[PDB]
Each structure stands twice: as structure tokens, then as C-alpha cells.
């Protein structure tokens, strides 16, 4: 159980995000329609993005929404300027029942999009178009660094702040652990998390840097694991989370868009080595 | 009696649109003073977009308004891109006691502004300058073609969908029945009512055609007649409702002010023959 | 005692505005955390513009604030577009304890910011850096015009609406008493307080100028003084407001840093004489 304290001026049902489990973290927001059919198109793109910035994840469920990729790109460039790829707006993801190439890891650290790109763009806007059935494990999982940065205790904050982390994949990546919200100002997290050097500590210092992160970031304060069903349209704060994917035993069958939207204006990578 | 679900952080008192009759169709907004003496502009004019777009219809009642015609351009230039005609900003609605030249129609069939132009609207803004006494129909209607799309039963929709309208007056106007918003995607209605030729159906179903979108969008729960009161102030989303005019037997004395605002940007008219 | 009307959509408690003595004007809102830890910059600024805009007056009271100068002009980049002195984004106005140059005058009168500009910014931002320990007097304060015309009787009224302000230091600067806001039109006084020529009205009338318009904006209806707390953002609309600051006994330890931001787009000092 639970209490709701959000009432909007907009057509919609608004409460705190909860993981299916009950638990509610310290951000997210669950959008619901306030009209029969009501389309998530119907909704101001301005008001949606204003929410997203400060509760940081939402999520809209029961809508109608969008009968194919082409759609959902013109409903995004609407929204804001998309930050296109060479496949265009739209990343396609999807998967099949108990499908499995040896070589994968079996789930994905916490991380953030446009670590090595030029721009990093603002957010993620996610729509399901279809998930049938339940799965076991394999959920997207989002972390609010604010509400880690209030789980540290005084000990672990001090090292969060003298470390920094040195990505490669060629690409190569530098950010502090510890950063200020590259528009806003607030602090934050950027973190890469192995499933890989952090400079700024000693070496001996590794072991403890990763196990206090990974205590804040995956607390129940902190951490959000999304069950996806059919037409849940989902809009993420890139800037201010950090996300990833849960281990799954059984791969259920599901098919996710993804289109990544810029920051206003967008966002030169301040963390890519040139 | 009805419910009030509204609270805003806006200093306004916000309730659902109803006739003068009680009816509470599925759109619309009531908007009323929050302080003694407050003016429309006292509100932000990007929020009331916001509301506009979600809401579709907003009136703001018991407002201190506009002066003259010249504040109410001033105004209009502030809230967006004004769409200007050869007269400027504001057509002048202006209409006497008794009034009525013997060739015209009792009424206006729904239908959407700039038809038949280069560029279409988002928004009619229409600020009411005087209407004293009580009319006897005349009222301004509106409807919610969302709504209309709810109503529809399979047969109904089936046809629709297959259903488009070329229109003329020389300039030339031809869309689908069933649309979807030019900017949002949502689903939506472009009809311009008879007091006309539809393609894509069988001649015979052209009857049918008729009175279905007619039940549909003359429906409580989509149709919305509006009573004017003096310094009302209407804000209605063009690229969703239809509007039109109900019958009059007395004509009553009423002036009424309208400004158009263009999209954002500018939207183009996707149904002019060129 | 009072009661509370808002409920808002953003993760914030909000509340109507009270002075330490408990008035309650017709202006202002509080705004306080609706999270722990949170700073300021997580609320959306498109947002608080609105906010600033309905309410004239913004008080962020509780929240995590700015590092230093530089933090906060990174932010006012983001918030809009800075007006920019020689000195840059940020004034700095600390006062020492029990300091006070013989010259001076006791307090301040209402006036607004950028009399003598050549463009008139239309928010004032103020970040209180520290303000330890209490002060006697010495608050700054914020009159709501708007308010202050709904308190003038008919013949108040009727002289304020035949006089002009004509003020110098040189620069030289020009106002009716009686003005229309520069972009949302609605009922504004423009008054810069004696601590100055007056003309349309007869000499005999200064005296009754003054004393009406005094009366009408330090009515408690139309009046508020800020007691400065640490960190306390706030956010005044210096389009609608005047500003001055109460006369003190015993200077206090204060520490403000003052950001302006231009209207949007920038306004063009409709008073200064060219």
C-alpha cells in the first residue's frame, strides 16, 4: 500500500512509480489516460517533457499508441529534436521466446547512452509494441544518481569524489563518477559498470569504489526495474539515470522502439576523448 | 451534479466543460479567476497551449479582458504565431438583435478553418466582446472528433475508413474522413459537413456515411454548444474539433472577436489542391 | 492559520506565500522540496517561468542551491536568456554586520530594474547564499501592482490614470503611472518612489499621488517582506512588481547574488529617453 499525491491539471491519472514487487523509489512517475481511447499524442510533448525532467522516468500505460515505426518517429519530432542514427530515428529491439552466439553476457551494468558519441542526447523515449506474456527476469532496469548520492555515507561519498572512470571499447571515454547535471547544475552520477580503470584512488580502493556504487545504485531507493506490457510508451532522463537490463533465465518474446531525443540545444559529449 | 477532479498550481479554479444544461461531453475546460479582478494575461500563455492541446476547448470565465482589438492582438502576438489575414489579426463577429439578405443558410454544418488555405491554424482564439440578454440558439458548437471515434460501432468505423471528401468553393479541399493529427498522431475526423462529394465508398453508402458521422459528432459525449457571456475568452484546438453554429430563431445582439494561431511551426494545408 | 489550495504534478509541496507575521498578499508562492536532498535544478525552469509569471513571486525555500557564482550563471543560462552586465551574470550584494559613508539613505524605495536600460529584464533571480543569525529591518520587499489597483477607490483610481513619472540620475526616464504589461497586456502600475516630477495632475495633487499609490501597494493585500534565508531561490516577475527594501536599525550578515533574464525575446525600455 501506498499513498497518491499527484493531481494534475492535464486528462490523465497521475501516481508514484512502483515496481511490481510494491517498492517505490525515489523517482518515476506512472501516467494513466483520463478519457476511454485516449491516445498518448493527445497529451502536450512540453508538459511530458517538463515531468521527465524532474521525476526523471515515466511511464505511460493503458494508452493507444502507435501503429508503426514511421509514427512514432513523426510523434518524436514533434516532441523535441531527435538525435538520428544512420537507421534513422528508430532503434528496433526485439526478441524471441527463449532465443540465445554464445558470447553475450547474461544482462548489462548500469550505464548511459552517448558515452561515446559526440552529442549525448537528453532522453530515451521507449515504446513496447508488443509483449505477450510474462517473462522470468530480463526486466530494464533504471537508477536515479541523485538518490544513490543520498545513500552514500560520508566514507563512501569522499571516494565517489575523488574517483574517475576511463572507458574504451577505438572509442574512449573519461568522465568524474561524481558530475554536476550538464544543463541543470544538480549533482549526479556517470558511471560505466563493469560486468574498465578508475583513476583518482588507489588501486586497493578499486574493490570498495564498485561495491559502495553498486550498494547505492541498485538500493530499493535508487533502482527501478521496468516489467514492459503492450503499449506502454516509456520517456527516460539520459542526463540524470543510469540504466541496464536485469539477468533473465527464460528470454520472453518482445518488441521495443527506441528514439533517442537532444538536449535543447543538444549536448556536445563532454567525456569523449578527442 | 457532476465531480471536480482539477487542482492546479496555477492561481485559477479549474473545473470540467458542461452545457448550459449540465451536459458534460468528453473534452473542454472551465477555467474561472483564482484573484479579484485577475485578466486573462495574468496566466502563462505556453500552459494554456499545453491545456488546449490535451483539453481541446478551454474557456476562461469571470476574466478581466481586453479593451479594444489592439490589446487583443498584442496578446495574440505573445501567445504564439499570429496567423494574419488582409484585415490584420482580429476578425470582427459582429451581430444585432433581429438581424437577417434572404439567401443565407439558418446554420453552420461542422467543419475545421483553412480548408481551402495555403496554411491551417492550431488555434482559434475568440475573445467575446459583448453579448447582452439570452439568445435562442445561435449558440457556437463545437465537437471532439476523438470522441466521435469512440462512439462509432464496427460498421460505422469500417466505413469512415474507407471514406474521403473533396470539397470546393475556384479553391479545392479533398481529405480522408479519418485522419490522423497533423503534428500528435492521434486519430482524429476531418469532415466538412453538408447543409460535397465522398469518394472511396459505394454511392448507395453515402446516406449512411452522413448520418453515422452525425450521430457520432453531434453526441453528448462529443458535442459541446456554447452560451457566450461577455469577455468569455475561448481557446479551441482546430486540428482536432470541428465547429459550426446552431440554428437561430432570434437572432440576439453579440460581438465576438477571433485571432488564429498558427502551429508550431506553421502547418502547412496537407488537403488543398494545388 | 490558512489553507492550502495547490497540488501540483512536480515533486515539490507548494503553498501559498506568508509573510514571518503570517499575511498573506494577493501574490507569491512557496515552493519546498518534495524530496530529500533535492536541488533546485531539478524542477523544470520552463516550468517556474510559468509559475513566476501567474504568481509574480517565487520563493524555492529548503532545496540544495548553488556551489558558487559560477554554478548559478550555468543555470540562469539554462533558465533562459541572461542579461549580461559588464560584470557578467551575477551581482553580488554582501552586507556585514552592523556596517554602514554617512551618505546613504535608510532603505529603498519601490522601483523596478532597468529604469535607465536600454532593456528591461523581465525576472529577477536571487540566490541568498548564507544569511546566518536574524536581522532586525533591513528586508527586502515586493509590492504585486496589480493588487495595489484593485485596492485604489474611484477617485484614486481615476487620478492615478492621469499621471505620469518622470525620473532622472545622465539618464533620464519616463513612465505613466497607470501601465499595461509589455507582453501580456493586463492593468500594471510603473511607479518609481520618492525616498522625481509628476505631471497630468496639478501641482496641488502630488501630495495625494503619493500618498494613494503608497497606501495601495504597502497594503498588506499588495505587499510582502522577505525574511533571506540560506539558500532560498527566488524568482521575481519585474514586470509586475516593484521592489524596494525596509528601512533596518542593526545591518545584518547577508550574502545575495542577483541573476536578470530578459524577456523573451528581449524587451526594449518602452520609458528611457532617447
Given at each position: ?148 548520492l543520498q545513500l552514500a555515507d560520508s566514507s563512501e ?106 538536449a535543447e540545444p543538444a549536448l556536445r559529449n563532454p567525456?569523449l576523448q578527442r
Open positions: 500500500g501506498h499513498m497518491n499525491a499527484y493531481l494534475s491539471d492535464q486528462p490523465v491519472r497521475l501516481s508514484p512509480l512502483r515496481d511490481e514487487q510494491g517498492n517505490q523509489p525515489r523517482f518515476g512517475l506512472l501516467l494513466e489516460p483520463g478519457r476511454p481511447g485516449m491516445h498518448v499524442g493527445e497529451l502536450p510533448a512540453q508538459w511530458l517533457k517538463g515531468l521527465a525532467r524532474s521525476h526523471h522516468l515515466l511511464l505511460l500505460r493503458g494508452f493507444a499508441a502507435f501503429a508503426d515505426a514511421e509514427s512514432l518517429t513523426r510523434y518524436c519530432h514533434d516532441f523535441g529534436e531527435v538525435m538520428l542514427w544512420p537507421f534513422g530515428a528508430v532503434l528496433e529491439l526485439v526478441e524471441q521466446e527463449g532465443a540465445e552466439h554464445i558470447f553475450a553476457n547474461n544482462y548489462v551494468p548500469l550505464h548511459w547512452d552517448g558515452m561515446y558519441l559526440e552529442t549525448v542526447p537528453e532522453f530515451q523515449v521507449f515504446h513496447c509494441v508488443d509483449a505477450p506474456g510474462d517473462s522470468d527476469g530480463g526486466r530494464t532496469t533504471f537508477s536515479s544518481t541523485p538518490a544513490a561519498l569522499e571516494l565517489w569524489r575523488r574517483a574517475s572512470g576511463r572507458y574504451q571499447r577505438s572509442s574512449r571515454s573519461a568522465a568524474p563518477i561524481v558530475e554536476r547535471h550538464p544543463r541543470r547544475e544538480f549533482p549526479i552520477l556517470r558511471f560505466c559498470e563493469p560486468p574498465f580503470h578508475y583513476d583518482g584512488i588507489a588501486p586497493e580502493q578499486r574493490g570498495e569504489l564498485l561495491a559502495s556504487l553498486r550498494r547505492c545504485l541498485y538500493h530499493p531507493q535508487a533502482h527501478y526495474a521496468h516489467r514492459w506490457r503492450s503499449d506502454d510508451l516509456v520517456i527516460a532522463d539520459n542526463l540524470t539515470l543510469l540504466h541496464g537490463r536485469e539477468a533473465f533465465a527464460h528470454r520472453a518474446p518482445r518488441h521495443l522502439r527506441r528514439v533517442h531525443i537532444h567525456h
